[PDB]
Design an enzyme around this catalytic site. Structure first.
Site, PDB file in Angstrom:
ATOM      1  N   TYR B 510       0.521 -11.005   5.293  1.00 43.91           N
ATOM      2  CA  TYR B 510       1.038  -9.656   5.278  1.00 43.91           C
ATOM      3  C   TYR B 510      -0.148  -8.769   4.977  1.00 43.91           C
ATOM      4  O   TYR B 510      -0.624  -8.025   5.848  1.00 43.91           O
ATOM      5  CB  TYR B 510       2.128  -9.507   4.237  1.00 43.91           C
ATOM      6  CG  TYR B 510       2.793  -8.159   4.231  1.00 43.91           C
ATOM      7  CD1 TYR B 510       3.838  -7.872   5.102  1.00 43.91           C
ATOM      8  CD2 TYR B 510       2.387  -7.169   3.334  1.00 43.91           C
ATOM      9  CE1 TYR B 510       4.459  -6.637   5.081  1.00 43.91           C
ATOM     10  CE2 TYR B 510       2.991  -5.937   3.303  1.00 43.91           C
ATOM     11  CZ  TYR B 510       4.029  -5.674   4.181  1.00 43.91           C
ATOM     12  OH  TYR B 510       4.633  -4.441   4.156  1.00 43.91           O
ATOM     13  N   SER B 593       5.099  -7.162  10.862  1.00 45.15           N
ATOM     14  CA  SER B 593       4.866  -5.800  10.342  1.00 45.15           C
ATOM     15  C   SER B 593       3.382  -5.594  10.029  1.00 45.15           C
ATOM     16  O   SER B 593       2.550  -5.926  10.846  1.00 45.15           O
ATOM     17  CB  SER B 593       5.741  -5.550   9.097  1.00 45.15           C
ATOM     18  OG  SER B 593       5.553  -4.252   8.571  1.00 45.15           O
ATOM     19  N   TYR B 594       3.037  -5.069   8.860  1.00 45.13           N
ATOM     20  CA  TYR B 594       1.632  -4.991   8.466  1.00 45.13           C
ATOM     21  C   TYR B 594       0.941  -6.307   8.781  1.00 45.13           C
ATOM     22  O   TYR B 594      -0.179  -6.330   9.294  1.00 45.13           O
ATOM     23  CB  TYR B 594       1.463  -4.691   6.975  1.00 45.13           C
ATOM     24  CG  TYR B 594       0.096  -4.158   6.685  1.00 45.13           C
ATOM     25  CD1 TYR B 594      -1.022  -4.992   6.678  1.00 45.13           C
ATOM     26  CD2 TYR B 594      -0.096  -2.798   6.469  1.00 45.13           C
ATOM     27  CE1 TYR B 594      -2.309  -4.468   6.439  1.00 45.13           C
ATOM     28  CE2 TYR B 594      -1.365  -2.266   6.220  1.00 45.13           C
ATOM     29  CZ  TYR B 594      -2.459  -3.093   6.215  1.00 45.13           C
ATOM     30  OH  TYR B 594      -3.692  -2.534   5.989  1.00 45.13           O
ATOM     31  N   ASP B 671      12.925  -0.388  17.442  1.00 48.75           N
ATOM     32  CA  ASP B 671      12.267  -0.309  16.157  1.00 48.75           C
ATOM     33  C   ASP B 671      12.010   1.163  15.789  1.00 48.75           C
ATOM     34  O   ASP B 671      11.167   1.836  16.380  1.00 48.75           O
ATOM     35  CB  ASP B 671      10.980  -1.132  16.133  1.00 48.75           C
ATOM     36  CG  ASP B 671      10.563  -1.533  14.705  1.00 48.75           C
ATOM     37  OD1 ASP B 671      10.346  -0.626  13.856  1.00 48.75           O
ATOM     38  OD2 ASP B 671      10.423  -2.735  14.358  1.00 48.75           O
ATOM     39  N   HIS B 703      13.275  -3.362  13.084  1.00 49.61           N
ATOM     40  CA  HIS B 703      12.068  -3.899  12.483  1.00 49.61           C
ATOM     41  C   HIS B 703      12.215  -5.273  11.883  1.00 49.61           C
ATOM     42  O   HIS B 703      11.235  -6.014  11.815  1.00 49.61           O
ATOM     43  CB  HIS B 703      11.490  -2.953  11.436  1.00 49.61           C
ATOM     44  CG  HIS B 703      10.086  -3.295  11.038  1.00 49.61           C
ATOM     45  ND1 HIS B 703       9.050  -3.374  11.948  1.00 49.61           N
ATOM     46  CD2 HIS B 703       9.549  -3.586   9.829  1.00 49.61           C
ATOM     47  CE1 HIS B 703       7.938  -3.699  11.313  1.00 49.61           C
ATOM     48  NE2 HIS B 703       8.213  -3.821  10.027  1.00 49.61           N
TER      49      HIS B 703
HETATM   50  N1  LIG Z   1       7.250   1.366   4.883  1.00 51.53           N
HETATM   51  C1  LIG Z   1       6.349   0.366   4.283  1.00 51.53           C
HETATM   52  C2  LIG Z   1       6.612   0.120   2.793  1.00 51.53           C
HETATM   53  N2  LIG Z   1       7.620  -0.933   2.744  1.00 51.53           N
HETATM   54  C3  LIG Z   1       8.219  -1.464   1.652  1.00 51.53           C
HETATM   55  O1  LIG Z   1       8.990  -2.448   1.802  1.00 51.53           O
HETATM   56  C4  LIG Z   1       8.019  -0.806   0.186  1.00 51.53           C
HETATM   57  C5  LIG Z   1       7.479  -1.541  -1.026  1.00 51.53           C
HETATM   58  N3  LIG Z   1       7.380  -0.914  -2.164  1.00 51.53           N
HETATM   59  C6  LIG Z   1       7.775   0.456  -2.229  1.00 51.53           C
HETATM   60  C7  LIG Z   1       7.674   1.206  -3.502  1.00 51.53           C
HETATM   61  C8  LIG Z   1       8.037   2.564  -3.574  1.00 51.53           C
HETATM   62  C9  LIG Z   1       8.562   3.256  -2.383  1.00 51.53           C
HETATM   63  C10 LIG Z   1       8.653   2.538  -1.194  1.00 51.53           C
HETATM   64  C11 LIG Z   1       8.244   1.112  -1.143  1.00 51.53           C
HETATM   65  N4  LIG Z   1       8.370   0.452   0.084  1.00 51.53           N
HETATM   66  C12 LIG Z   1       7.942  -1.359   4.089  1.00 51.53           C
HETATM   67  C13 LIG Z   1       6.629  -1.046   4.804  1.00 51.53           C
HETATM   68  C14 LIG Z   1       6.667  -1.204   6.326  1.00 51.53           C
HETATM   69  O2  LIG Z   1       7.772  -1.356   6.856  1.00 51.53           O
HETATM   70  N5  LIG Z   1       5.534  -1.169   7.029  1.00 51.53           N
HETATM   71  C15 LIG Z   1       5.526  -1.148   8.474  1.00 51.53           C
HETATM   72  C16 LIG Z   1       4.054  -1.128   8.956  1.00 51.53           C
HETATM   73  C17 LIG Z   1       3.235  -0.893   7.678  1.00 51.53           C
HETATM   74  C18 LIG Z   1       4.182  -1.132   6.501  1.00 51.53           C
END
Ligand SMILES: N[C@H]1CN(C(=O)c2cnc3ccccc3n2)C[C@H]1C(=O)N1CCCC1
Ligand SMILES: *[C@@H]1O[C@H](CO)[C@@H](O[C@H]2O[C@H](CO)[C@@H](O[C@@H]3O[C@H](CO[C@H]4O[C@H](CO)[C@@H](O)[C@H](O)[C@@H]4O)[C@@H](O)[C@H](O)[C@@H]3O)[C@H](O)[C@H]2NC(C)=O)[C@H](O)[C@H]1NC(C)=O
Ligand SMILES: *[C@@H]1O[C@H](CO)[C@@H](O[C@H]2O[C@H](CO)[C@@H](O[C@@H]3O[C@H](CO[C@H]4O[C@H](CO)[C@@H](O)[C@H](O)[C@@H]4O)[C@@H](O)[C@H](O)[C@@H]3O)[C@H](O)[C@H]2NC(C)=O)[C@H](O)[C@H]1NC(C)=O
Ligand SMILES: *[C@@H]1O[C@H](CO)[C@@H](O[C@@H]2O[C@H](CO)[C@@H](O)[C@H](O)[C@H]2NC(C)=O)[C@H](O)[C@H]1NC(C)=O
Ligand SMILES: *[C@@H]1O[C@H](CO)[C@@H](O[C@@H]2O[C@H](CO)[C@@H](O)[C@H](O)[C@H]2NC(C)=O)[C@H](O)[C@H]1NC(C)=O
Ligand SMILES: N[C@H]1CN(C(=O)c2cnc3ccccc3n2)C[C@H]1C(=O)N1CCCC1
Ligand SMILES: *[C@@H]1O[C@H](CO)[C@@H](O)[C@H](O)[C@H]1NC(C)=O
Ligand SMILES: *[C@@H]1O[C@H](CO)[C@@H](O)[C@H](O)[C@H]1NC(C)=O
Ligand SMILES: *[C@@H]1O[C@H](CO)[C@@H](O)[C@H](O)[C@H]1NC(C)=O
Ligand SMILES: *[C@@H]1O[C@H](CO)[C@@H](O)[C@H](O)[C@H]1NC(C)=O
Ligand SMILES: *[C@@H]1O[C@H](CO)[C@@H](O)[C@H](O)[C@H]1NC(C)=O
Ligand SMILES: *[C@@H]1O[C@H](CO)[C@@H](O)[C@H](O)[C@H]1NC(C)=O
Ligand SMILES: *[C@@H]1O[C@H](CO)[C@@H](O)[C@H](O)[C@H]1NC(C)=O
Ligand SMILES: *[C@@H]1O[C@H](CO)[C@@H](O)[C@H](O)[C@H]1NC(C)=O
Lengths: 729, 729
Positions: B510, B593-594, B671, B703
């Site tokens: 990841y 994803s990432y 997506d 997604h």
């Molecule tokens: N939106 C990105 C962040 N995510 C999380 O699951 C996540 C983790 N910790 C958090 C803490 C505070 C607020 C929001 C948070 N969100 C999904 C990721 C994601 O889908 N991608 C797609 C391509 C690059 C990353």
């Protein structure tokens, strides 16, 4: 044998080119032709030639030129640059005009940028053009143009250009203008797209485009609201720079207006006579309308008596659309290819005031086109010779006696040339024949007067030398008899064919109504490589629904699309293993477009006959494709018409049977023709019943996946898949 | 050994399930829990239980129920049905309420259909709800509701619910309402989406849908126009059925309004105190605002002195967003996880009127969360134990002496339990611990008072029996030292590991900023199968940019996304062949994803280290993803900020290097998060330089490609690809 084979690179990198001999007749004895990048004018009687335009005459113009058009008096040259493709036929360009006499390009009142269309008058130097959906008329190449229409609106009203569905399925052209021979009148259709639903899809574009564009297009899918059509004529002589122009409506006939109709042909008869053809939205009834000009009034009258009713009891009118009429000079008669009583298409003599026509040809073969009309002769292409539907020759018929017919191409080069096509000079004094199989393409000039051949124009002797260095495959053209009828097939056989070894076989397919995949034409394509290099039999087969063998065959698929044409390909594959040189463990199948739809239906049949298939841009369900084409064969998808077979015929309903096979689905994401949605639904279906299969999307590509890089890519991808199923290194 | 292996079906068909023990505390000593389909209430001190709602009480309702919520006085039950997913957190449902005492569901003034959100007050039985983008307040479950806002507009103004980007990247919730503890006030944010560009894409839908839908969503990509935010509070006691309601604006602080900002936290302190946090669109500066209520006025004042400035010199504020504050009961202080001087995140004591905070914890480890606050103790989760970032325990700290800390979970079951998480009862009298690795998940109830364990709640003894029948793999957690720093990895090793045989290796990835793939959690997933059945080492590795090991590591990737985190995975793979049990001819790599973005960057590096990779839903270029997330790490893509690395870091610019590898690109066509466009551009790039690769689109999937049929399909597809590159039958 130590000779190299025809490799995948050869085809892709495009190593062995067929030379062409493309000419534009400009008179009765001269034609234009391109040598390197200058344009030569030629004398047809003697062969001699002159420079007309050098390949440096537009060095200093600072814009790359795409095409060119010559006014019907040799006076000015139109130059097409800034070309931008739209659909199959449409585009937008910039245009400049060059006075050939004064050696000077015009600067005052230029043709505006992003013009949809432009066409000279037949005589003289009048232009007409369409820009932002409206007709404009330039009388001389540098006076202000006259705006003929004011109704033009993007996606809504098209003046003198067709809309999406009209372009593809009816006119096979963007152009919706017709000059009178004199150059006095301009007739145009106008299309109204207001209630037509749009197809929407993404175009991702260059990496620099941060947000994907949504392309929207008025596109009427089966049973949806069609465009409406209206028709106008305008006297280009009475054109004022103060009054607007009076267009004159020619309404469709009474028996067209009571329902949805299409305008399907526009042919001018004489200076003051225009024939129009119309088709019911149920395409088994067509009406032609002789519209004469009236002095006293300044209106165009279409006498109800002069109407000629072409209809069909067993299927649809015409091959795809109803046939063009060809008028005798006076204008009181004409010939027109029509389906006869037995079902075969032939030439019919129509006299403009009487009901019945007389058949001037007959027999168990069909007429392909009418090509020339003189006082004394009608010239036509037909497949009569050797009773071979696959073949094409040229014939003439004595107007004074319908019994006296000479073949003009049959016996010209018989071992090499079985498939001819022709271009006649302005009054038919000469005709270039172009043969294009089974030997290497041949181009020869002739003189009408005595049918003397003058000289050979291009023989591909340079290509012929080269090919001798190569283990080229051969083509067997033959037929097999099912249910007491003759159906034809072709096999591209690998070189050094040993008929006692068992070969793997690829069945190439299209099989859309009235198509022909088993012919005498010489092609250098993907099949060759699979024959030369990989030793695969690539065979094609024309079954029910197929073209050029009478209505009894072509109309067998009526309202039953995705049945017999499918079933038949299966039985074709069966008889191929019966022949003894076919490995019945390694039979595959593939097609593009319609062919991709038959391909999928076949893999989805559970017939245990095919190991693997490829489907490119497949139709997946008839309610997803355009109305004009779809309905022509299937009717409307309503519970009272043909909704039930519209349902019985999807790829999706056949998903479970794919468990038994290997499948490669391919589709371009910018396909305006067969939308990505068609496959998007084949794959979702497959996913849903747990079947593994291979996919490939082609981003921004359209229906022909024509982009150079994409082309190479697809034929690469396809090749790997193919070898993999066949166990080759 | 004759035991079966963990097969692909086992995972997919979902054969061996971990039992869960999910409870909802409803008081200080009772909790709610589900056995089959009735709801049991439990006593925490004694274990005893009673039926609360039978699994037949809503037989006659004729609507399938999806969830349920209980009013904070046990009086009424909310019932959520007609559930329709939107994004990660959003949805729409219908709701009915049931009077638990009178045994009767309400019929007058029902909650309207397609409600976006609904939440009880903290005490009593006030509801609030959002429907067509506006806030409504029901005082009692069956009187007419009061409309609080009138500005609500689809896609434009969101009242009390977040918009796309706020939902995903800031609040991790659809909900944008906060009740005061008393239940007197209602604070809500309102989002303005007017100038925000939309992402458009096709949804093909059921086969019956003749025309594909275009879904449009306000989605601000890097550097584009963001939503604006405003904040309001309303006294739900002074609510008139004749006057509209007076909302009260709390403006952001002066040092926020001079540029683009985000509202990033809303926490109530006491009955008449609310704390707000704001973040600059350049996310290295955050400001918290203590807003006290004023009697005399009926307004909320935010004294400039009370502001607490959290900022960062080396990267971005917070892990993803800035930390929540936890208030002492009186409201004059609070604790809050903050990054210290050395760089490690710890607990800080804030007194509401003074500038400096005091650190109450420290050392080369980090605090994961604060979990409970009592008079005497703060309860926190940390990775302190055994110096293992991968691990999670529970600690308490003596408010009277910051030196006296007891571990409460470390020594509870040490061979089985190294990763804990907790749920505390209403006033913290008890706490369920949930351990979730390295052994089978364990759930136990405790009493705060003396830290006595009461009983075990679920041990997965039924699952434990079963697994003994199966050739289960093991997990090695360890670290490797690069540049004098410790980086951690995990390997899922196949059963009967022979350390002198060379195994093929899949590197799972990841590696997004602050992620953790090398942990002590017990998972039963795709990796297991590739370990049990196919004998592949599946190893993950946390390199620079990774989480929970101080800012020196996490902030190494600052404005340099797609560099060190990529480089590191490569060196990780290197050290893995150095270890001697790795087949350096069969190293692969994959992520979602990432992870799919790092996967592609790695294959595109020309490092000759990887034979093949899979990328699912990959980011392809940072200017294609959402602004809030993207900018947090990369800055703005403008020639003065960080446009240059924004360009140096696309997958596309690395297309030529893919010639050296096998690549499987996968993407869902619906997506909303990482748009199909991201891959659409990776593939076009690949096509353009003549590289062969495998693709698979997943129609209408988002997604997480969560659909049951799609899930199974993808892990099937992925598996074939994997075995194929590795030469397995
Ligand atoms: N939106 C990105 C962040 N995510 C999380 O699951 C996540 C983790 N910790 C958090 C803490 C505070 C607020 C929001 C948070 N969100 C999904 C990721 C994601 O889908 N991608 C797609 C391509 C690059 C990353
Ligand atoms: C192919 O080659 C052809 C023969 O060379 C050639 O045909 C003509 O070539 C040139 C240019 O077109 C002609 O010269 C011009 O001819 C006209 C007519 O000349 C006649 O009439 C005048 C007066 O009425 C007499 O005095 C002359 O004697 C003559 O009979 C002149 O008016 C011009 O000024 C000029 O001299 C030539 O006559 C044509 N040749 C013949 C004998 O047919 C074609 O141009 C060539 N075509 C191609 C494709 O390049
Ligand atoms: C777990 O099991 C618990 C023990 O069985 C149980 O706690 C109580 O159970 C019931 C129902 O809640 C209680 O009965 C009720 O009790 C009240 C109070 O009774 C006291 O007060 C009256 C008058 O003031 C006296 O006369 C009585 O003698 C008594 O001391 C009554 O008013 C009700 O009418 C009724 O009788 C019971 O007392 C509780 N048990 C004890 C001894 O603590 C829980 O319900 C169980 N919890 C779960 C999760 O199911
Ligand atoms: C078609 O488009 C081009 C570009 O907009 C126009 O070309 C310009 O012409 C002016 C005047 O002749 C020149 O000075 C410029 O060099 C041109 N611009 C460019 C491309 O740099 C042209 O005028 C347009 N034609 C019409 C008829 O609209
Ligand atoms: C939510 O949607 C449904 C359907 O539109 C509504 O349910 C109807 O309720 C009436 C009156 O109670 C019943 O007679 C019908 O049986 C229902 N219709 C259906 C689904 O067949 C319901 O009223 C809606 N609720 C609200 C508050 O708007
Ligand atoms: N539009 C269909 C017809 N075509 C022709 O090339 C064609 C041939 N003869 C014509 C004669 C008259 C007018 C128009 C004609 N068009 C392409 C086909 C096509 O793309 N598909 C896609 C799925 C099913 C068929
Ligand atoms: C062409 O023919 C038309 C017949 O309508 C006639 O009116 C017109 O004047 C002619 N124009 C010329 C000069 O060719
Ligand atoms: C086109 O058709 C619609 C009827 O469907 C009509 O209302 C509209 O005015 C027309 N447009 C023109 C200018 O012909
Ligand atoms: C012609 O028609 C157009 C559009 O109806 C109008 O704007 C214009 O005034 C007319 N031209 C003249 C001068 O009659
Ligand atoms: C044309 O096809 C329709 C379709 O139902 C059919 O009913 C009718 O027989 C045909 N009409 C004519 C005039 O042949
Ligand atoms: C709750 O606390 C607020 C403090 O603002 C007070 O005004 C209100 O009356 C209280 N309501 C009750 C009865 O809990
Ligand atoms: C939202 O923002 C725009 C400014 O970009 C403003 O004009 C519009 O009125 C606002 N809508 C509301 C009701 O807040
Ligand atoms: C409250 O506001 C709404 C929208 O502004 C308006 O329609 C309504 O008249 C107001 N209600 C009353 C009765 O004050
Ligand atoms: C935050 O980041 C910006 C980005 O250029 C930088 O210039 C500045 O040093 C930082 N601001 C603060 C207050 O640390």
């Amino acid at each position: 044998d130590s000779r190299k084979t025809y490799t995948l690179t050869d085809y892709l990198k495009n190593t062995y080119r067929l030379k062409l001999y493309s000419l534009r007749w400009i008179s009765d004895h001269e034609y234009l032709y391109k040598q390197e990048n200058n344009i030569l004018v030629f004398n047809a009687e003697y062969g001699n030639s002159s420079v007309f335009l050098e390949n440096s005459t537009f060095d200093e113009f600072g814009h790359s030129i795409n095409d060119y058009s010559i006014s019907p008096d040799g006076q000015f040259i139109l130059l097409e640059y800034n070309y931008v493709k739209q659909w199959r036929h449409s585009y937008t360009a910039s245009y400049d005009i060059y006075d050939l006499n004064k050696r000077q390009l015009i600067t005052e009142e230029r043709i505006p940028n992003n013009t949809q269309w432009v066409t000279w008058s037949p005589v003289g130097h009048k232009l007409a053009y369409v820009w932002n959906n409206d007709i404009y008329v330039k009388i001389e190449p540098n006076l202000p143009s006259y705006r003929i229409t004011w109704t033009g609106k993007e996606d809504i009203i098209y003046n003198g250009i067709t809309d999406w569905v009209y372009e593809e399925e009816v006119f096979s052209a963007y152009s919706a203008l017709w000059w009178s021979p004199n150059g006095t009148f301009l007739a145009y259709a106008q299309f109204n797209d207001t209630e037509v639903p749009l197809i929407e899809y993404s175009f991702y574009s260059d990496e620099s485009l941060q947000y994907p564009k949504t392309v929207r297009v008025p596109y009427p899918k089966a049973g949806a609201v069609n465009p409406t059509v209206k028709f106008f004529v305008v006297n280009t002589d009475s054109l004022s720079s103060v009054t607007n122009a009076t267009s004159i409506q020619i309404t469709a006939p009474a028996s067209m207006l009571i329902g949805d109709h299409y305008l399907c042909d526009v042919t001018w008869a004489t200076q003051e006579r225009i024939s129009l053809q119309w088709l019911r939205r149920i395409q088994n009834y067509s009406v032609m309308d002789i519209c004469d000009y009236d002095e006293s009034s300044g209106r165009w009258n279409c006498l109800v008596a002069r109407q000629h009713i072409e209809m069909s009891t067993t299927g649809w009118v015409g091959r795809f659309r109803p046939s063009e009429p060809h008028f005798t000079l006076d204008g009181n008669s004409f010939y027109k290819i029509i389906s006869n009583e037995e079902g075969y298409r032939h030439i019919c003599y129509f006299q403009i005031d009487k009901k019945d026509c007389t058949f001037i040809t007959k027999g168990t073969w069909e007429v392909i086109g009418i090509e020339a009309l003189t006082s004394d002769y009608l010239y036509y292409i037909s497949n009569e010779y050797k009773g071979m539907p696959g073949g094409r020759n040229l014939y003439k018929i004595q107007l004074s006696d319908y019994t006296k017919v000479t073949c003009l191409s049959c016996e010209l080069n018989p071992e090499r040339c079985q498939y001819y096509s022709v271009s006649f000079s302005k009054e038919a004094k000469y005709y270039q024949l172009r043969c294009s199989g089974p030997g290497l393409p041949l181009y020869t000039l002739h003189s009408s007067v005595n049918d003397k051949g003058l000289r050979v124009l291009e023989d591909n002797s340079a290509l012929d030398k080269m090919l001798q260095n190569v283990q080229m495959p051969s083509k067997k053209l033959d037929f097999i008899i099912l249910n007491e009828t003759k159906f034809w097939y072709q096999m591209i056989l690998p070189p050094h064919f040993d008929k006692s070894k068992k070969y793997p076989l690829l069945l190439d397919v299209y099989a859309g109504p009235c198509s022909q995949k088993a012919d005498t034409v010489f092609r250098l394509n993907w099949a060759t490589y699979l024959a030369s290099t990989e030793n695969i039999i690539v065979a094609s087969f024309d079954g029910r629904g197929s073209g050029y063998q009478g209505d009894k065959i072509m109309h067998a698929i009526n309202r039953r699309l995705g049945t017999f044409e499918v079933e038949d390909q299966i039985e074709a594959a069966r008889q191929f293993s019966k022949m003894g040189f076919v490995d019945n463990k390694r039979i595959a199948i593939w097609g593009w477009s319609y062919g991709g739809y038959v391909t999928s239906m076949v893999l989805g049949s559970g017939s245990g006959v095919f190991k693997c298939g490829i489907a490119v841009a497949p139709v997946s369900r008839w309610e997803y494709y355009d109305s004009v084409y779809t309905e022509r064969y299937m009717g409307l998808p309503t519970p009272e018409d043909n909704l039930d077979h519209y349902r019985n015929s999807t790829v999706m309903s056949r998903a479970e049977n794919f468990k038994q096979v290997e499948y490669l689905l391919i589709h371009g994401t910018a396909d305006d023709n067969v939308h990505f949605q068609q496959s998007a639904q084949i794959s979702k279906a497959l996913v849903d019943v747990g079947v593994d299969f291979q996919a490939m999307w082609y981003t921004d590509e359209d229906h022909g996946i024509a982009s150079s890089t994409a082309h190479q890519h697809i034929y690469t991808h396809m090749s790997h898949f193919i070898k993999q199923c066949f166990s080759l290194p």
